[PDB]
Amino acid sequence: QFAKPEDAVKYRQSAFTLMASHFGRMTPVVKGQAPYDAAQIKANVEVLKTLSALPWAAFGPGTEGGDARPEIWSDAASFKQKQQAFQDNIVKLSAAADAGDLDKLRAAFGDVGASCKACHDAYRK
Amino acid sequence: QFAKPEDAVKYRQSAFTLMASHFGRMTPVVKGQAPYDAAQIKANVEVLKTLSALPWAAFGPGTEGGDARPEIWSDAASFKQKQQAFQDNIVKLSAAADAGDLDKLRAAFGDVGASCKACHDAYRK
Ligand code: HEC
Ligand code: HEC
Ligand SMILES: O=C1O[C@H]([C@@H](O)CO)C(O)=C1O
Ligand SMILES: O=C1O[C@H]([C@@H](O)CO)C(O)=C1O
C-alpha cells in the first residue's frame, strides 16, 4: 500500500507512535498512580491489540529507511521471531485485560514492555 | 494521555496517517484496478473502523497546534457534528464490507471520503 519506500516508513513510524501511546498510557495504572477501571483497560488493550498487528507489513522488501536497521531484512527469521514473541505477549495482555485481573495485567504489561525493548535494542538504529 | 499539547498533536497526526493508508489503499479496489477480495476488505475496514475512532480524544482542551484550525475548539458543536457524521459514515462502510457487496462498498467509500474532505476544508489549516 506504499507507493514509495518512504510511505512504508511513515506508516510504521505512525503505528509505533500509536502503540507507544496505548501502551505507555497504562503505566500510571499499572503503577497504581492512576485508578484501575477494568472496562477502560479492556477497551484500551483492544485498541493496542489492533495497532500492534500493523507495523509488520510495512517492513516489506525494499522498505529500508527511517530508524530501521538493515539487519531486519538480512536476518528475517530473527526479526520474525522478535515480532512474533511481541504479538504473542500482546495476546497474553488481552487475556489479562479481558479477565479484569490487575496482577495478571501488571505481569503481562511487563512482558510486553520487555519485548518492545528487546526489538528496540536489536533492530532500531 | 498527552503530557504536553505536542503529544496530542503527534498522536492525532499519526492516527490520520494510518486512517489515510487504510482508506486510500482501497481506492484501486473501489476503482476496479486491483481485485476485490471481500474478506480482505472486511478485515481492512475493521482496522479502519478502530483507527477512525482515535483522533477525537486528541483534540482535548489546550491541544491547539499542528494543522488544526482554532475553530475546532471555538465551534466545538460544529466540529462534533463533522466528526460524528464521519464516524457514522464509517459504520455504513463497515456494514457494506461486512456484507461483501461491492456496490454498497463503492457508495459507502465515496460518502466516507466526502466526510474526510468536508472536515479537511473547514478545520485543517
Ligand atoms: C511495544 C508496545 C513497542 C513500543 C511501545 C514501541 N515499539 Fe518499536 N520500532 C521498531 C523498529 C524497527 C522501529 C523503527 C521504525 C522506523 O523508523 O522505520 C521502531 C520504532 C518505534 C518508535 C518510534 C516511531 C517514530 O515515531 O519514528 C516507537 C515510539 C516505538 N517503536 C515503540 C521495532 C519494534 C519491534 C520489532 C519486532 C517491536 C516488537 C517493537 N518495535 C515494539 C514497540
Ligand atoms: C477520512 C478517512 C480522513 C482522512 C483519510 C484524513 N482525515 Fe483528517 N485531519 C483533521 C484535522 C483537524 C487534521 C489536522 C491534525 C493536526 O495536524 O493536528 C487532520 C489531518 C489529516 C492528515 C495529516 C496527518 C499528518 O500527518 O499530519 C491526513 C493524512 C488526514 N487528516 C486524512 C480532521 C479530520 C476530520 C474532522 C471531523 C475528519 C472527519 C477527518 N480529518 C478525516 C480524515
Ligand atoms: O516500554 C518500552 O521499552 C522500550 C524502550 O524503553 C527500550 O529502550 C520501548 O520501546 C518501550 O515503549
Ligand atoms: O479522500 C479524501 O478526501 C480528503 C482530501 O482529499 C480533500 O482535500 C482527504 O483527507 C481524504 O483522504
Residue numbers in the entry:
A (entry chain A), B (entry chain A): 1 to 125
What does the literature reporting this entry say, word for word?
Cytochromes c′ occur in methanotrophic, denitrifying and photosynthetic bacteria and have proposed roles in protection against nitrosative stress, NO trafficking during denitrification or pathogen defence. All cytochromes c′ have a 4 α-helix bundle structure containing a heme centre with a solvent exposed proximal His ligand and a buried hydrophobic distal pocket with a non-coordinated residue (Leu or Phe, rarely Met or Tyr) in a position to exert steric influence on the binding of diatomic gases. Unusually, cytochromes c′ are able to utilize both heme faces (distal and proximal) as a means of discriminating NO from other diatomic gases. In order to understand the factors controlling distal versus proximal NO coordination, we have examined NO binding to AXCP variants in which the occluding distal residue Leu16 is replaced with residues that are smaller (Ala, Val), of comparable size (Ile) or larger (Phe).
Kinetic data confirm that this variant has a high degree of distal steric constraint that destabilizes distal heme–NO binding (vide infra).
